[PDB]
Amino acid sequence: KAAAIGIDLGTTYSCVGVFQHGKVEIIANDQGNRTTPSYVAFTDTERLIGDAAKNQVALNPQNTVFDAKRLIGRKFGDPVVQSDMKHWPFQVINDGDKPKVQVSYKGETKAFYPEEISSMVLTKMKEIAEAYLGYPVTNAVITVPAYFNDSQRQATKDAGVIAGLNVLRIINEPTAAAIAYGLDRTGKGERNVLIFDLGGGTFDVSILTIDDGIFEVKATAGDTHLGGEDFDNRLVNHFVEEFKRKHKKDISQNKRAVRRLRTACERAKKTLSSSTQASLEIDSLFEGIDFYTSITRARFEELCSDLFRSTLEPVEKALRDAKLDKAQIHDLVLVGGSTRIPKVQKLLQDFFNGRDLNKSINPDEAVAYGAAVQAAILMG
Numbered sequence: 001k002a003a004a005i006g007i008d009l010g011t012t013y014s015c016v017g018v019f020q021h022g023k024v025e026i027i028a029n030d031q032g033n034r035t036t037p038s039y040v041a042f043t044d045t046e047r048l049i050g051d052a053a054k055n056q057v058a059l060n061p062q063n064t065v066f067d068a069k070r071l072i073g074r075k076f077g078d079p080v081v082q083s084d085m086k087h088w089p090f091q092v093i094n095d096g097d098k099p100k101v102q103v104s105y106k107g108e109t110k111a112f113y114p115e116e117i118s119s120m121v122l123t124k125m126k127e128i129a130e131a132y133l134g135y136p137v138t139n140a141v142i143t144v145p146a147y148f149n150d151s152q153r154q155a156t157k158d159a160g161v162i163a164g165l166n167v168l169r170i171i172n173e174p175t176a177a178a179i180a181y182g183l184d185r186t187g188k189g190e191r192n193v194l195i196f197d198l199g200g201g202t203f204d205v206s207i208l209t210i211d212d213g214i215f216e217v218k219a220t221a222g223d224t225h226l227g228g229e230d231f232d233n234r235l236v237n238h239f240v241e242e243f244k245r246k247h248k249k250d251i252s253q254n255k256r257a258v259r260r261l262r263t264a265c266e267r268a269k270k271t272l273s274s275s276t277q278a279s280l281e282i283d284s285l286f287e288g289i290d291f292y293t294s295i296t297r298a299r300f301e302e303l304c305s306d307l308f309r310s311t312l313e314p315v316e317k318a319l320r321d322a323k324l325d326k327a328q329i330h331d332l333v334l335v336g337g338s339t340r341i342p343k344v345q346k347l348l349q350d351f352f353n354g355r356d357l358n359k360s361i362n363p364d365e366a367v368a369y370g371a372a373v374q375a376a377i378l379m380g
């Protein structure tokens with residue numbers, strides 16, 4: 001009788017849905033947010049997950065973990081791990097050629113596997129669903145990137161099992177997004193679907209063939225270090241210059257200020273997807289100096305124009321790989337929070353010569369939406 005849930009375990013944000021009453025419900029967390037930061041923080045006295053964790057990241061950069069998805073299922077000597085390490089404020093150590101995140105927790109040094117950190121996020125998403133349903137959840141579908149290997153999929157599933165979940169299936173994020181739009185219901189005859197996924201940290205282009213409910217991955221492309229956080233950064237640097245000009249002070253080395261600016265920037269950015277201007281007002285940003293100011297959509301676009309534009313060549317590459325022309329793509333699907341940006345939608349639509357974009361499902365929710373559907377199918 002109990003519904004199974006669908007979980008998007010995201011690099012920067014996660015999302016949970018449940019199919020019931022003949023429809024998918026994306027479930028808001030305790031703060032009312034329909035997605036949750038994939039953050040876990042450790043303090044002298046408690047463990048925080050999601051919104052609570054990200055909310056104190058500037059205060060505790062050392063023991064606030066994020067990006068665990070970049071580690072999960074990898075060996076410590078993997079060049080991706082070695083490269084990514086150099087830019088996290090938290091320490092990563094080697095335990096038998098397995099990466100562990102090392103932190104201080106209740107005064108003692110503790111280390112955690114990536115799948116342990118991710119299980120804490122999965123636990124939160126599970127608790128979010130249970131608060132809405134009013135009963136314990138034990139079955140779930142969890143998603144992963146198409147490019148995940150066996151080791152990565154295994155560790156993701158272990159994360160689920162650790163969270164107390166029977167993992168009915170692990171499915172690809174682009175397939176979940178396609179399922180959400182009901183594209184799996186097609187009969188015999190190949191349809192070509194392109195998934196354009198620009199999230200918080202990663203950019204993924206997938207071309208799938210669907211034939212009588214059977215998915216095949218024809219081509220993948222993108223950039224694992226291109227995302228919304230890079231748009232936040234462009235804004236950070238802009239406002240650091242503007243604060244320097246006005247107050248004649250350089251805040252760029254105060255890690256707490258820069259982090260707090262960064263957060264205000266992400267909020268303003270989101271607002272610029274619905275508004276042509278946004279107000280940025282930080283109390284005591286630096287040395288008790290407040291920062292009240294504004295930014296326009298057009299200025300935001302200018303600051304990011306090259307990054308926005310860079311998203312189209314991986315589409316070209318993926319089409320070439322799949323041996324398809326633009327015109328042979330039957331459906332275009334927007335995934336990831338960053339595809340809410342009007343300029344981004346314009347770029348892709350212009351690239352496809354005016355074709356419709358499938359964007360009626362919040363793109364940062366499309367993966368979980370699909371997972372919830374598949375979970376229900378697997379339950380009966």
Ligand SMILES: Nc1ncnc2c1ncn2[C@@H]1O[C@H](COP(=O)(O)OP(=O)(O)O)[C@@H](O)[C@H]1O
Nearest residue numbers: 010011012013199200228270273336337338364
């Ligand atoms: N309305 C919006 N406009 C612009 N960016 C948004 C909006 N909503 C969310 N985002 C951005 O989307 C990114 C998170 O994307 P999401 O798909 O939720 O996570 P992930 O990439 O981790 O799966 C963040 O960079 C966030 O600021």
Ligand SMILES: [Cl-]
Nearest residue numbers: 197199202204
């Ligand atoms: Cl992505």
Ligand SMILES: [Mg+2]
Nearest residue numbers: 010011199336
């Ligand atoms: Mg995503």
Ligand code: NA
Nearest residue numbers: 008010013014
């Ligand atoms: Na996500």
Ligand code: NA
Nearest residue numbers: 199200201202
């Ligand atoms: Na991402």
